[PDB]
Amino acid sequence: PGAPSSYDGYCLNGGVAMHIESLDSYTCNCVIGYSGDRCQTRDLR
């Protein structure tokens, strides 16, 4: 389970590529305003 496999064009903005194995796998930390786990929902804040 997870998506470490490729961290290419894996984040959209805040995208601080941090392995969240902890809870799941590899993810990005998006800005306070961009979330959804990929800063794909740039909730412009």
DSSP string, 15-41: -EEEE-TTTSSEEEE--TTEETTTT-E
Topology of 1-45 in CATH?
Answer: Laminin (2.10.25)
Inter-residue contact 32 to 9 (CB < 8 Å) = no
The upper half-sphere exposure of residue 14, i.e. CA atoms within 13 Å in the direction of its Cβ, equals 20
Would you state the structure tokens that stand for residue 7, as one six-digit string? Answer: 């961290």
Inter-residue contact 26 to 2 (CB < 8 Å) = yes
25 vs 30: CA distance, rounded Å: 15
| Structure obtained using | NMR
Would you state the structure tokens that stand for residue 14, as one six-digit string? Answer: 């805040």
